[PDB]
Amino acid sequence: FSKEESREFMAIFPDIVRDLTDAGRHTDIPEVTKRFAKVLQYNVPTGKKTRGLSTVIAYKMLEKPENLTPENVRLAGILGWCVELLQASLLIMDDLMDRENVGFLAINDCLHVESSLYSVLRKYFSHLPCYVPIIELFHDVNFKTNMGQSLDALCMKDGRPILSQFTMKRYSSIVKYKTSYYTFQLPVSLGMYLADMYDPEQHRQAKTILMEIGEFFQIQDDFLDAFGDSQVKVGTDIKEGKCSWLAVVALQRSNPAQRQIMEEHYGRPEPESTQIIKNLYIELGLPATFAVYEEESFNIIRTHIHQISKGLPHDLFFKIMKKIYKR
Amino acid sequence: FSKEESREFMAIFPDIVRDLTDAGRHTDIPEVTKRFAKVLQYNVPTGKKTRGLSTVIAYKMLEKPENLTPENVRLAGILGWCVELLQASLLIMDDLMDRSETRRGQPCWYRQENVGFLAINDCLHVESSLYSVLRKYFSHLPCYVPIIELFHDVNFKTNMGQSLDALCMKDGRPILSQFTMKRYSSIVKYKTSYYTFQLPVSLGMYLADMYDPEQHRQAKTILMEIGEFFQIQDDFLDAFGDSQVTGKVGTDIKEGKCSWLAVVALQRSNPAQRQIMEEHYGRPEPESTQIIKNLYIELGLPATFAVYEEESFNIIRTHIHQISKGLPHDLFFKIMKKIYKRDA
């Protein structure tokens, strides 16, 4: 993203904190509002805000050039921060399920941070025609993300992976509901609504390509968890018994002997068991299978983007595609 | 509540479960929608649904008599179930946070096989679900956005209450310097009074197309006063109630809760009595709970509660008489009549 784009986006964050914790209200509960300021400051604005900045870029590429005022680009930035509040709530839920001090999280902090995005939406968007579509989008994406988290959990029982559950159909459903809706659909649909693009067929056209990009994003992430260079963090998907693309394709390709290695060694704490699974992935040619998928999926997605109709700009989707595939 | 009111309200619940789990959506993930039906069935419909039924009663007393149709009373019932969905989400999370054993005689959801900390996802899922119910039944009505905004605002405020409650503890040990009547009043207001008292009445007002900010303000003032008495009565009965009639053995002392009893005990205590609270309050040993209970008796908290109950009843009744605009006084007298001198 541009130096200008990053600086104007980051400049919004302190306002959102004041809006949620000060707002010149002279609160009767300053101790807990000061704590909530720290929860927001310590968890929301740090590292890459790729979903938030992607909301701004989406809007800038969908809106009429004449309507790209500083005021409208700032509203796009505020929507991006609502996406980052959602992201923060989900990472807090992950931190809590993993497991006072600086960086302490309360169990209800994830519910509280999630709820806060609706206060931001009400403050800035309640008088604009895009308001109800935007709040309904957040409601629907929230519900779908929760269903994705539950589907992922239904691949584990008594701390053991249920390998009978590791199908490509279930995997595709987990990625779609748990990740693709809030990561890929939400930023683009927000940009479209702020640009007063309400046509359901336009949103459906964007959705089809964004779910395809989302699936490759997660498959690449899964591949690199096992086969990536740590010095470019250490992957724990095998140890944690995750429903990974690697595990799903391993089970498709496995003979009975190879399947029994997965049953015995997948989702075990012992480092030796991780190396046994990695050795099986190498034997089954999962790297070559990933290489073929990467090429074939790139070509199909590029084709669908070139074919994008309903008055949608293809360059927006190419920018996203190029970002994920690193063309 | 009438036999009719209870049965018509209960008839709505299975429709809401179908709306959220069997309405032709998410056909690729039936195992999730089937599980979510079980989450709703366990956590939402087995209580007294006092907040849900109170939404219907509020609406019936606020709406113009000639406007009360079976169709509009059903919409009030659906809003009542949305309150019960919010409450279910909050209590799923609170039971995990407090590591509680039971809730309304049922094992806490987080204790059920293969849930534990996944109760966090179920909490967020149940809370998110009420906005899908609002969309289906209210999207075409003027009250739609005010009701959405009220639910999100009450969720935010309830979280401020829960987090303020947590700031009365340091790593599972009560901070007795934090146990002031000011902090107690703030915890009750934010953590329980907004969702329990303000939310049902404000929903009734919005469905009756009552949007006057001053009406909502006057309603809030009296409902926060009633809400404080209700929680003080609840706190008193945790220690001094009969387990067989309350339907629960009280563990507030064991849990180190910022209860009205603990707050008033500290106000009334000499330094020796303060030392007993410092040493024994919030301890797991049954002997420590008995020592605190015995100190509450020594300090005359039963007599103190009886005086508070009579004085606060009189003060709130006076305030309801002074309510202006066109708010029905009878709504607030009906709440008081239900609440005052209760033993459960």
Ligand SMILES: CC(C)=CCC/C(C)=C/COP(=O)(O)OP(=O)(O)O
């Ligand atoms: C709509 C879009 C494009 C959203 C995707 C958000 C996302 C997590 C991308 C990863 O890129 P990154 O630059 O944050 O990560 P890395 O440094 O690993 O490439």
Ligand SMILES: CC(C)=CCC/C(C)=C/COP(=O)(O)OP(=O)(O)O
């Ligand atoms: C606006 C009004 C008057 C709301 C009703 C408040 C109330 C008395 C709740 C009691 O709930 P409960 O202890 O019966 O619990 P539950 O209904 O959850 O079982």
Ligand SMILES: CC(C)=CCC/C(C)=C/COP(=O)(O)OP(=O)(O)O
């Ligand atoms: C944001 C969240 C999760 C809010 C929880 C709200 C609530 C009503 C908790 C119960 O309070 P308690 O723990 O003091 O009482 P009990 O469990 O005894 O009902």
Ligand SMILES: [Mg+2]
């Ligand atoms: Mg990963």
Ligand SMILES: [Mg+2]
């Ligand atoms: Mg109690």
Ligand SMILES: [Mn+2]
């Ligand atoms: Mn509790």
Ligand SMILES: [Mn+2]
């Ligand atoms: Mn609690």
